[PDB]
Design a protein around this motif. Structure first.
Motif, short mmCIF file in Angstrom:
data_model
loop_
_atom_site.label_atom_id
_atom_site.label_comp_id
_atom_site.label_asym_id
_atom_site.label_seq_id
_atom_site.Cartn_x
_atom_site.Cartn_y
_atom_site.Cartn_z
N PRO D 14 0.82 -1.20 0.00
CA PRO D 14 0.00 0.00 0.00
C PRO D 14 0.85 1.25 0.00
O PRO D 14 2.03 1.22 0.36
N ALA D 20 -8.37 5.62 1.68
CA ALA D 20 -9.64 4.89 1.65
C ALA D 20 -10.86 5.70 1.24
O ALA D 20 -11.48 6.32 2.10
N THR D 31 -20.71 13.45 3.86
CA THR D 31 -20.88 12.14 3.23
C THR D 31 -22.27 11.98 2.63
O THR D 31 -22.40 11.51 1.49
N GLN I 2 -21.06 3.94 6.37
CA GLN I 2 -20.45 2.63 6.66
C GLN I 2 -21.38 1.75 7.46
O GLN I 2 -22.18 2.22 8.24
N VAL I 10 -12.97 -1.18 3.82
CA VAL I 10 -12.15 0.03 3.71
C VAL I 10 -10.74 -0.20 4.29
O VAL I 10 -9.75 0.22 3.67
N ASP I 13 -8.78 -2.61 1.93
CA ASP I 13 -8.38 -1.89 0.73
C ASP I 13 -7.17 -1.01 0.98
O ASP I 13 -6.30 -0.91 0.13
N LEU I 14 -7.10 -0.39 2.15
CA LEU I 14 -5.96 0.46 2.52
C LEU I 14 -4.67 -0.33 2.65
O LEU I 14 -3.60 0.23 2.55
N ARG I 15 -4.79 -1.64 2.85
CA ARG I 15 -3.65 -2.55 2.72
C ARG I 15 -3.40 -3.06 1.29
O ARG I 15 -2.31 -3.56 1.01
N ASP I 107 -21.56 11.08 11.82
CA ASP I 107 -21.50 11.91 10.62
C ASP I 107 -22.77 12.72 10.39
O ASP I 107 -22.72 13.86 9.94
N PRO K 69 -3.04 1.93 -3.51
CA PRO K 69 -4.04 2.19 -2.48
C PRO K 69 -3.43 3.00 -1.38
O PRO K 69 -2.31 2.69 -0.95
N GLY K 70 -4.14 4.04 -0.94
CA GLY K 70 -3.58 5.03 -0.02
C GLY K 70 -3.20 6.28 -0.77
O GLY K 70 -3.01 7.34 -0.17
N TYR K 74 -5.96 7.19 -6.66
CA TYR K 74 -6.55 5.83 -6.58
C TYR K 74 -7.85 5.94 -5.81
O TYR K 74 -7.91 6.65 -4.84
#
Ligand SMILES: CCC1=C(C)/C(=C/C2=NC(=C\c3[nH]c(/C=C4\NC(=O)[C@H](C)[C@H]4CC)c(C)c3CCC(=O)O)/C(CCC(=O)O)=C2C)NC1=O
Ligand SMILES: CCC1=C(C)/C(=C/C2=NC(=C\c3[nH]c(/C=C4\NC(=O)[C@H](C)[C@H]4CC)c(C)c3CCC(=O)O)/C(CCC(=O)O)=C2C)NC1=O
Ligand SMILES: CCC1=C(C)/C(=C/C2=NC(=C\c3[nH]c(/C=C4\NC(=O)[C@H](C)[C@H]4CC)c(C)c3CCC(=O)O)/C(CCC(=O)O)=C2C)NC1=O
Ligand SMILES: CCC1=C(C)/C(=C/C2=NC(=C\c3[nH]c(/C=C4\NC(=O)[C@H](C)[C@H]4CC)c(C)c3CCC(=O)O)/C(CCC(=O)O)=C2C)NC1=O
Ligand SMILES: CCC1=C(C)/C(=C/C2=NC(=C\c3[nH]c(/C=C4\NC(=O)[C@H](C)[C@H]4CC)c(C)c3CCC(=O)O)/C(CCC(=O)O)=C2C)NC1=O
Ligand SMILES: CCC1=C(C)/C(=C/C2=NC(=C\c3[nH]c(/C=C4\NC(=O)[C@H](C)[C@H]4CC)c(C)c3CCC(=O)O)/C(CCC(=O)O)=C2C)NC1=O
Ligand SMILES: CCC1=C(C)/C(=C/C2=NC(=C\c3[nH]c(/C=C4\NC(=O)[C@H](C)[C@H]4CC)c(C)c3CCC(=O)O)/C(CCC(=O)O)=C2C)NC1=O
Ligand SMILES: CCC1=C(C)/C(=C/C2=NC(=C\c3[nH]c(/C=C4\NC(=O)[C@H](C)[C@H]4CC)c(C)c3CCC(=O)O)/C(CCC(=O)O)=C2C)NC1=O
Ligand SMILES: CCC1=C(C)/C(=C/C2=NC(=C\c3[nH]c(/C=C4\NC(=O)[C@H](C)[C@H]4CC)c(C)c3CCC(=O)O)/C(CCC(=O)O)=C2C)NC1=O
Ligand SMILES: CCC1=C(C)/C(=C/C2=NC(=C\c3[nH]c(/C=C4\NC(=O)[C@H](C)[C@H]4CC)c(C)c3CCC(=O)O)/C(CCC(=O)O)=C2C)NC1=O
Ligand SMILES: CCC1=C(C)/C(=C/C2=NC(=C\c3[nH]c(/C=C4\NC(=O)[C@H](C)[C@H]4CC)c(C)c3CCC(=O)O)/C(CCC(=O)O)=C2C)NC1=O
Ligand SMILES: CCC1=C(C)/C(=C/C2=NC(=C\c3[nH]c(/C=C4\NC(=O)[C@H](C)[C@H]4CC)c(C)c3CCC(=O)O)/C(CCC(=O)O)=C2C)NC1=O
Lengths: 162, 172, 70, 49, 161, 48, 172, 162, 172, 172, 172
Positions: D14, D20, D31, I2, I10, I13-15, I107, K69-70, K74
């Motif tokens: 990453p 994200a 949002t 979420q 999420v 995906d960040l990984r 939020d 990603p990050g 992206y």
């Protein structure tokens, strides 16, 4: 008329979009749930007669004074229109059970309720007490997920009236 | 908006009655066939683009006048409008198919549509044909899909057809 | 009927009815929610020329004007 | 020399400081609003619509 | 600051209550983990520099961050960044020993979000630097301690975002 | 004054005749000044 | 919008003239009876809810079909719409009564109303009747109120009636 | 057409509301005020002839050059259309007096005034001077609240023209 | 927005990774407890009005200053404003409870809320308390309902509490 | 919107063809006369106010009924509307004159105009006349301007006339 | 909005003066070089897509972190936003180049832009670089085009560069 099916279709249409796996998963819930719903519906349907007479009376037993002369639980016409009204509620509860959503309740009883009750001097308290009683007796006609369904809709009416 | 249950409910209410044991079991059967119904709606969604494309290729194969200058699917702007309408109609047919009732199709799509096309000069008979081709291919897909359990979907294929046929009739 | 209460002047009291048929302009495919291109607006007399100006400005075709209040 | 990486770190490491998607919206709290959903009166709508 | 034990004492002191039975269960747990928290703390300490030389490698350097225009460009700023990293590691080790995150608020998080906004320090990139050190830590400390160390790294990182 | 906003081109193009007005100041719109976004952030003030 | 003075002015202007001594004194008389007029408008405002309620009770007493399924004052949503319309009409009748002219009633309420109801399937004859009942009760109140000075309000009671009768005629 | 009566009704209607004590108090003002208004109206009505000839002349006396050849105060038709125009103003002043508001003035003279005067090369100064003169003479035809009313509306026209 | 799954996604995906077998089974467990979750959300919905009412009665029992002139729940509009805010917060807490994630609450409801109240002069400590009372009663209902199958809902009762506690903390 | 070139292009396209050498040279001639065209449009713009004013003075000279009470150019409000319409029509005639095509005039101004006026009670024959007077004066200006090079502008004066005559015909 | 003439005019007016013979001839020179200017603006318009594409390919060649990603380019949504911004900036640079003044660029594009990106977490140094690459390629095209008359465009190439450099400076 709000059902799981109409809701997902409405949401697709409004984004100009074919139904996708999100929307079909939703529909499966409504279809999987039909058995419990429809058992509640059949039990409420055949007991209707007595559920209505039970709740009507309970309105007078909880509000004794209603049945004295000059009052709104007196004479054939008031007491007749009362039975009818509770019968309307049970009818729409069965419809909401069968339909898979609150639509029938929203469209035929909730929309306009307070304005009507306020013009005609009908206290919600009676109707809540009719429904609380119907809820007590439906405890022994059903159980499991049919009871939960019956409850869901009875409670929905009680919140509409508070 | 109506679905097949909601329709039952409206007719019952007009009698002042709890649903008839007649109507109850008709609806119990709809729940019985609902997995098949979901596959049928899924068949259309999963091939929407090809259904429109294949209908299209064939419409203009037959009616080469539409793609000449003077024709209602010429130039690019008009072809895109025609492709868009094919999608819109296929979309409301799939909605009706999930619902078990034509009303969303009739109320949101078919109502006024013919008079729109006539105002525009859009040849309604060609539009009707494009709908007939979508029907052929859509049902093709409903009948021959990816690893669905084998059984009989003819009842649903008929019902889908009547939605395609409603649209065609309404427009021509 | 119409929009109802208007401006208090007598020249705001007169509302008229316009049946149109808006056409697709040019330049662009509309993929959003489209409506059937007929419709009708009821407009008071004080407003009318902006409204007819923006109606015929967007490729529209004014089909009928009707005197509904006056 | 400038576009030098780790010991080959191949292509699915990453990025440092991951973000994200729909977190800048979550950071500002916009949002439900970016993008806002389109609400419209269809013809012959029911009561709930 | 407060730890597990003083968290309980102060919660009862404001009610003027002697410690009662359920409260005493809670103190029993802290003494049960006291051995592992100490052994685990030691390991981190002497292996610290090694540990920190793995979190940066997997979450910060070899990137635009270390290149001209990046916030950890210049030996000055690279030094400031891994200096910060050492703070986080060290304080998380305090929080985990204490069994209370209150020290992470009092001496680390308070004002830090805005401090980073004011200097331009990239927040998301710093969180990844925290969650990479957690990853390394959880390997080194083993089954016994992994979950307990981890939470105070997670406390730190949701404190910035 | 109120009619000047509703009879404008920006209303008629976007919202038409049946679409409820929705928030557009957080994405990009054609013919915008780039101060239009942080001004909208100042105007926003949270969901509640 | 017109009131009784404004009406005079429009007719004078169409002659190109200052108001006739005829018209002047007709308007002097309206000012003469204006305290009574204020009491008459106040009679309606002060009993609006009961006027609507009592009209309503009686409308459905007579026409028990409206409150059956199939009927236009069933279910709650429709009854609320019907109660709302009763209020709207009583409201514009009171405005006309303050004004000394029917125009606000005809222009903002009655214009198009019949065709609305027919489009909706709302039985206009029932709506006309609900208006007749509001009239009976409203005038009742105009004639027998709380410690108003005793005198003759029949001119105003007539005029109020014609506003109720305009509405009825326009709708039936 | 703006009167106290139409204004309060407009304000009620726009809030979907019956007339209440606020609105009826307002109406009483308009009715209480009618006597003074209508006295002003009767005096302005019967003196109209001379008020108009007085003001017409004063336009020429204050703008002498207007009455020379090639100018807009020359020949029967200009001088005729002038008398007429001042007569229109006095007419609408009496209407505004009788009506209980500026409506008649707003709708028949103010709306469009400048566009018309600008296309036809009519200077407001003349009209202000016609009205200033009419205001001078109305000082001795009326007094008290009828004069205040007459003044209110004459001044209203002068501000409309500045 | 979420939910608990979306949150997992999420972070994965960040990984740059497919979900870890770790994360997979955490989510398998959420599906395992989902019937209980539905009952818990249903407990709140089915008693929303009473939860707000009972919280309210008790808030003003404790803080009789709010219902005096000068107080922030006086006169009727302010009380009406205070009564939905109670409803609004209970509503977003129920949404979070269906979702298995606090984000919709943070939020759409909690973000900016404290600063709103301070601008308004609304005493945040009183609002925090009203939230604490809603929590007590809401959980009461989650724990003691109509003919639900007997089992252990403490995990869900905790999680619901943290949503009530988030709101309280955020506001005070 | 069309101009004289755009018109050519649309007709060519309907044949499926590149522009005919016929059409090419017709357009080469329009470019040939374009300086004159610019002077002609400039003649109208530079005297717009006087063209409207002079048309106006003369319209009411002829039709003294319009400026009496009862008349459609009385009171100030109506006269301003009438003066405004004179400007609007003169404006679209000048646009057509720059374009070499009537379409902007027909589509944005003349389409529906007659039916508007009839709905309003505006005497169309008087409006037609006001247009005839604008034509006389406008052409006057096109023919006798400030230090323009001497030549023949009759072709352009005709074409301008047909735009004035279109409007008149369309309205009367 | 300003162009190079409008700028002159504003400065003259602030003196209360007719344009200086100094300023007049500076503007006469701008008219002198205007064909070259049109070719320069045309060079950018005619290769806009490639200028953005080529800048892009090279930006991500250098900064492979943005497409992990990050990273801020992206997933597809963010890359499309980044490609869109590249176009927006190239667009306002071309406008400034037609105008002979930076104001449209500074007022409609650069004003607030840096603070937007920082709020978003968009790495401004990467955006500055993308602008530097667009500059290289854009000028490439300004200098080596299709059958333009041979001459010296260095003055215009400089001026274009300063617009690219303004944007870069403003953003980094
Ligand atoms: C479709 C769904 C639907 C509902 C729910 C409904 C309620 C309803 N109840 C009404 C009257 C009534 N409702 C009652 C109710 C009662 N009287 C008693 O003895 C008890 C206290 C109580 C029963 C618990 C009474 C006495 C009236 C007559 C009110 C009147 O006209 O004075 C009316 C007025 C029209 C009429 O007189 O029938 C409506 C619309 N109507 C509908 O269409
Ligand atoms: C409610 C859902 C819905 C439908 C169904 C719909 C139909 C519809 N089709 C339209 C146009 C069109 N539709 C077509 C379709 C065709 N042309 C052909 O030659 C073929 C026979 C056919 C394709 C199979 C074309 C070419 C136009 C553009 C007509 C024109 O502008 O000249 C328009 C005019 C507005 C526009 O162009 O966007 C509407 C409203 N709009 C809607 O909102
Ligand atoms: C995500 C939404 C969703 C879908 C799509 C869904 C489909 C679905 N289709 C099923 C059965 C089936 N589906 C079909 C469908 C067909 N048979 C044919 O030969 C035709 C080609 C096709 C006609 C449409 C048949 C025959 C069965 C087995 C009989 C039945 O269960 O009714 C079943 C029962 C399990 C099984 O037998 O596989 C499910 C769950 N369930 C869902 O929750
Ligand atoms: C302009 C100020 C500045 C400098 C100087 C700087 C140096 C710098 N050198 C690095 C690595 C490195 N630098 C070297 C350098 C050497 N190895 C040796 O044995 C020799 C003694 C020496 C070469 C003369 C090596 C071998 C690495 C890789 C180390 C690793 O990846 O663990 C890295 C990490 C890789 C990266 O992300 O770029 C940085 C940031 N950064 C800066 O911002
Ligand atoms: C996103 C969902 C959402 C929330 C949560 C929300 C809160 C909120 N509460 C408000 C007012 C208010 N809120 C309260 C609440 C209280 N008063 C008390 O004394 C108690 C301590 C407390 C009730 C427990 C009161 C009294 C006002 C009115 C303040 C005033 O106008 O003076 C207002 C100002 C606008 C208005 O009055 O409608 C907002 C925006 N708005 C939202 O859209
Ligand atoms: C706040 C707005 C407002 C109102 C409402 C108002 C009423 C009002 N009504 C009055 C008289 C009156 N009002 C009435 C009315 C009636 N007589 C009857 O017998 C009928 C039942 C009723 C028919 C409508 C009569 C007869 C008089 C005495 C005669 C008159 O003054 O005209 C008077 C004169 C003082 C008096 O004699 O009491 C006032 C001020 N004034 C106001 O400023
Ligand atoms: C309903 C209210 C109303 C007003 C106020 C009104 C004003 C008015 N004055 C006009 C003309 C005129 N007004 C005057 C005025 C004057 N000439 C003089 O000797 C004096 C300097 C001055 C009187 C103070 C003149 C000379 C004309 C003829 C202008 C022309 O057509 O050239 C015209 C043009 C139409 C026509 O020629 O009659 C209007 C509309 N019209 C209306 O409908
Ligand atoms: C309409 C939406 C919907 C709901 C609401 C739903 C509820 C639901 N709750 C269930 C079980 C249950 N629900 C509970 C809940 C509780 N136990 C307690 O003692 C507490 C008082 C309460 C805590 C929340 C428990 C313990 C079970 C049995 C264990 C399980 O199935 O997980 C089951 C499994 C069948 C059963 O055992 O009855 C269903 C279907 N299903 C649905 O589709
Ligand atoms: C698309 C460009 C366009 C045109 C052409 C247009 C015409 C037009 N003229 C109007 C009114 C009018 N037009 C006139 C014109 C005249 N009265 C006469 O007696 C003369 C014969 C004639 C002047 C030569 C008058 C007096 C009215 C006002 C009618 C009324 O309200 O009573 C109105 C009603 C709205 C309004 O009053 O603003 C429209 C829409 N509107 C437009 O947007
Ligand atoms: C700013 C926009 C613009 C304008 C207005 C313009 C006008 C213009 N009119 C011209 C010629 C002319 N213009 C006219 C016009 C007329 N001759 C008459 O006798 C009539 C009174 C009038 C009829 C319309 C004639 C006859 C010529 C000379 C022949 C020609 O060049 O076609 C010329 C050629 C140079 C010249 O001979 O003076 C230009 C540049 N150029 C422009 O760029
Ligand atoms: C006035 C003309 C104008 C400009 C200049 C403009 C910039 C701008 N860029 C934005 C987003 C963005 N801009 C980029 C750009 C980049 N990402 C990278 O990594 C690169 C370094 C760079 C491309 C070279 C990205 C990725 C976003 C989306 C950020 C997000 O939502 O996470 C947004 C937020 C709204 C949206 O996403 O549509 C604005 C307002 N908006 C405007 O209206
Ligand atoms: C449709 C809008 C429009 C354009 C684009 C236009 C271009 C245009 N460029 C021209 C000249 C030219 N253009 C250039 C441009 C260049 N020279 C180079 O070597 C560079 C590669 C390039 C730098 C930008 C040069 C050097 C001349 C000749 C000198 C001059 O006329 O200034 C000329 C004069 C005629 C000629 O010499 O060809 C025209 C008309 N005219 C227009 O009306």
């Amino acid at each position: 008329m709000k059902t799981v099916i109409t809701e997902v279709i409405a949401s697709a249409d409004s984004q100009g979009r074919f139904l996708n796996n999100t929307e079909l998963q939703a529909a499966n819930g409504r279809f999987q749930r039909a058995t419990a719903s429809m058992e509640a519906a059949r039990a409420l349907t055949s007991n209707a007669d007595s559920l209505v007479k039970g709740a009507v009376q309970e309105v007078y037993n909880k509000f004794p004074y209603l049945t004295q002369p000059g009052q709104m639980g007196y004479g054939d016409t008031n007491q007749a229109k009362c039975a009818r009204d509770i019968s309307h509620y049970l009818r729409f509860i069965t419809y909401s059970l069968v339909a898979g959503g609150t639509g029938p309740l929203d469209d035929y009883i909730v929309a306009g309720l307070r304005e009507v009750n306020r013009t005609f001097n009908l206290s919600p308290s009676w109707y809540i007490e009719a429904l609380k009683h119907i809820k007590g007796k439906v405890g022994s006609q059903l159980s499991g997920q049919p009871l939960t369904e019956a409850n869901a809709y009875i409670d929905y009416c009680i919140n509409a009236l508070s | 908006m109506q679905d097949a249950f909601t329709k039952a409910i409206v007719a019952a209410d007009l009698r002042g009655s709890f649903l008839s044991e007649q109507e109850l079991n008709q609806l119990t059967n709809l729940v019985k066939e609902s997995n098949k119904r979901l596959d049928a709606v899924n068949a259309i969604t999963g091939n929407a683009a090809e259904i429109i494309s294949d209908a299209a290729h064939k419409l203009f194969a037959e009616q080469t006048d539409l793609i000449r200058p003077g024709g209602n699917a010429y130039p690019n702007r008009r072809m895109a409008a025609c492709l868009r309408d094919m999608e819109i109609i296929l979309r409301y047919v799939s909605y009706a198919l999930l619902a078990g009732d034509a009303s969303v199709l009739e109320d949101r799509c078919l109502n006024g549509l013919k008079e729109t096309y006539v105002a525009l000069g859009t040849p309604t008979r060609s539009v009707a044909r494009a709908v007939q081709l979508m029907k052929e291919t859509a049902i093709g897909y409903v009948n021959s899909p990816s690893g669905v359990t084998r059984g009989d979907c003819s009842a649903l294929v008929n019902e889908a057809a009547t939605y395609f046929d409603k649209a065609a009739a309404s427009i021509a | 009927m119409y929009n109802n209460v208007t401006a208090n002047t007598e020249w705001g009291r007169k509302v008229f009815k316009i049946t149109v048929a808006q056409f697709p302009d040019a330049d662009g495919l509309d993929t959003d929610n489209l409506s059937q291109s007929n419709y009708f607006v009821t407009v008071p007399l004080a407003r009318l020329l902006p409204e007819m100006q923006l109606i015929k400005n967007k490729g529209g075709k004014v089909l009928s004007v009707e005197p509904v209040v006056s | 020399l400038r576009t030098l990486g780790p010991p080959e770190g191949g292509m699915l490491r990453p990025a440092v400081g991951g973000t994200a998607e729909a977190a800048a919206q979550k950071q500002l709290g916009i949002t439900a609003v970016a993008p806002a959903s389109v609400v419209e009166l269809r013809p012959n709508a029911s009561e709930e619509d | 600051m407060q730890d597990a034990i003083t968290a309980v004492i102060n919660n009862y002191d404001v009610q003027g209550k002697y410690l009662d039975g359920a409260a005493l269960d809670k103190l029993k747990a802290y003494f049960t983990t006291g051995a592992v928290r100490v052994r685990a703390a030691a390991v981190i300490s002497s292996n610290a520099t090694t540990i920190i030389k793995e979190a940066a490698a997997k979450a910060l350097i070899y990137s635009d961050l270390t290149r001209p225009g990046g916030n950890m460009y210049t030996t000055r700023r690279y030094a400031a960044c891994i200096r910060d990293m050492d703070y986080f590691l060290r304080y998380a080790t305090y929080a985990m020993l204490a069994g209370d995150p209150s020290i992470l608020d009092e001496r680390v998080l308070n004002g830090l979000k805005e401090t980073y906004n004011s200097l331009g320090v990239p927040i998301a990139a710093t969180v990844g630097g925290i969650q990479a050190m957690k990853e390394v830590v959880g390997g080194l400390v083993g089954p016994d301690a992994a979950k307990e160390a981890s939470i105070y790294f997670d406390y730190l990182s949701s404190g910035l975002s | 004054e109120i009619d000047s906003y509703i009879d404008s081109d920006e209303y008629i193009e976007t919202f038409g005749e049946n679409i409820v007005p929705y928030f557009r100041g957080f994405k990009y719109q054609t013919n915008q000044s780039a101060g239009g976004f942080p001004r909208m952030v100042k105007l926003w003030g949270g969901d509640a």
